[PDB]
Design an enzyme around this catalytic site. Structure first.
Site, short mmCIF file in Angstrom:
data_model
loop_
_atom_site.label_atom_id
_atom_site.label_comp_id
_atom_site.label_asym_id
_atom_site.label_seq_id
_atom_site.Cartn_x
_atom_site.Cartn_y
_atom_site.Cartn_z
N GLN A 28 -22.57 45.80 28.48
CA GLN A 28 -21.85 45.58 27.24
C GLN A 28 -21.62 46.85 26.42
O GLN A 28 -20.82 46.84 25.49
CB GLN A 28 -22.58 44.55 26.36
CG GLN A 28 -23.93 45.03 25.76
CD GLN A 28 -24.68 43.92 25.08
OE1 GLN A 28 -25.23 43.05 25.72
NE2 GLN A 28 -24.73 43.96 23.77
N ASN B 285 -29.26 39.59 31.89
CA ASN B 285 -28.85 40.30 30.69
C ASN B 285 -27.48 40.92 30.93
O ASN B 285 -26.91 40.83 32.02
CB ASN B 285 -29.91 41.35 30.34
CG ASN B 285 -29.91 41.74 28.89
OD1 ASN B 285 -29.05 41.33 28.10
ND2 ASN B 285 -30.89 42.55 28.52
N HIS C 204 -30.21 37.70 20.44
CA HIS C 204 -29.56 38.30 21.60
C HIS C 204 -29.22 37.20 22.61
O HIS C 204 -30.10 36.45 23.01
CB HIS C 204 -30.50 39.36 22.20
CG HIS C 204 -29.89 40.17 23.29
ND1 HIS C 204 -29.20 41.34 23.06
CD2 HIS C 204 -29.94 40.02 24.63
CE1 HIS C 204 -28.79 41.84 24.21
NE2 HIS C 204 -29.21 41.05 25.18
N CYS D 271 -23.18 40.39 23.73
CA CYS D 271 -24.06 39.63 24.61
C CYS D 271 -23.77 38.13 24.56
O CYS D 271 -23.81 37.45 25.59
CB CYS D 271 -25.52 39.94 24.26
SG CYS D 271 -25.94 39.86 22.51
#
Lengths: 219, 8
Positions: free
Chosen positions: A21, A186, A166, A27
């Site tokens: 990102q 992630n 997040h 995210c």
């Protein structure tokens, strides 16, 4: 009902490559497209990266989202439902900045018909959804250096709270010598964690808020 | 209760 002791949706061909990102707080958008990517594979047999940038640029203030300054997976899904589509990542690639909305139905790669929110703190219900529906979008409390510095093993941080900040994607669960964990994708690239993944403590009291606000879309 | 996923 009986559930598997461990699940890994990467082994079922439902998880795209890890994305990066950059210096944009997108995210939430990556979490949302990752959840939908799995459902697209389950419906059509195609594994296609979907456009996080499309959400950043187009699922904005009417959806409570602020682009590179954060958003919500649930209202990302609502945008895809309202819009009758989301573009492929190839057609609408990620730039790690806020842009004018450039959605084009010519390059639609997926749709979304509904999404489901799971109950606060219920890791048992999260496990059922991961086993039986697919990868689940979740928030975690990532505001700890131990999270960014994680390299391997099962992550546990005593300073963690249940307040999420997040967006990530639960793509499985398991145990590492009886230490139970969530397998979490992630969006910090392949150099984060275990090739972009973090195994987070499971059944340790909603650790880091992983089960505070789970949701998943359907097609 | 949900926090936007800002101060980052």
């Amino acid at each position: 009902r009986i559930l598997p002791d461990s699940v890994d949706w990467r082994e079922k061909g439902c998880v795209t490559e890890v994305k990066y990102q950059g210096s944009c707080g997108a995210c939430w958008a990556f979490s949302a497209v990752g959840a939908l990517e799995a459902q697209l594979k389950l419906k059509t047999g195609k594994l296609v990266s979907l456009s996080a940038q499309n959400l950043v640029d187009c699922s904005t203030e009417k959806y409570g989202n602020k682009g590179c300054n954060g958003g919500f997976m649930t209202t990302a899904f609502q945008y895809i439902i309202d819009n009758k589509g989301i573009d492929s990542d190839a057609s609408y690639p990620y730039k790690a900045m806020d842009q004018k909305c450039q959605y084009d139905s010519k390059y639609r790669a997926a749709t979304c018909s509904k999404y489901t929110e799971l109950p606060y703190g219920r890791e048992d219900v999260l496990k059922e959804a991961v086993a039986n529906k697919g990868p689940v979008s979740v928030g975690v409390d990532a505001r700890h250096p131990s999270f960014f510095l994680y390299r391997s093993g099962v992550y546990y941080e005593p300073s963690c709270t249940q307040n999420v900040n997040h967006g990530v994607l639960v793509v499985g669960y398991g145990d590492l010598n009886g230490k139970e964990y969530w397998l979490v994708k992630n969006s910090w690239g392949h150099n984060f964690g275990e090739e972009g993944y973090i195994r987070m403590a499971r059944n340790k009291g909603n650790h880091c808020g992983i089960a505070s606000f789970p949701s998943y879309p359907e097609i | 209760a949900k926090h936007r996923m800002v101060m980052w």
